[PDB]
Design a binder for this molecule. Sequence first.
Ligand SMILES: [Cl-]
Ligand SMILES: [Cl-]
Ligand SMILES: [Cl-]
Ligand code: NA
Length: 124
Amino acid sequence: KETAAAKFERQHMDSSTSAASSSNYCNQMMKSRNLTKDRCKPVNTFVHESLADVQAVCSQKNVACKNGQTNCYQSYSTMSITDCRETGSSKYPNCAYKTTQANKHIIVACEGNPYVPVHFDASV
Ligand SMILES: [Cl-]
Ligand SMILES: [Cl-]
Ligand SMILES: [Cl-]
Ligand code: NA
């Protein structure tokens, strides 16, 4: 039974690469992080920065989350991200994703002690 912090790490962190360099990145990563077990997760963003740099966002600019909560934080700098989104021809169990690499600010929700990211809200 996964903690919130660990679920964030599994779903969103990929520090081993600086950027997605292939159209198949999302297909491979969504499968290897177990996000296509039982269902195709429709949307998911991977962040290509160190874990420490992402955890540090919880001390940066405090903003509202899309749901109105006030424990969201926007990174001061842009970060290398890859957005993975299911295509129109995807359906379980043959999940298929479009890979879009970008450099954007991230917005995360933070909780706990230590105060760490638990939800990925958006990128700007
Ligand atoms: Cl897992
Ligand atoms: Cl996401
Ligand atoms: Cl402020
Ligand atoms: Na946690």
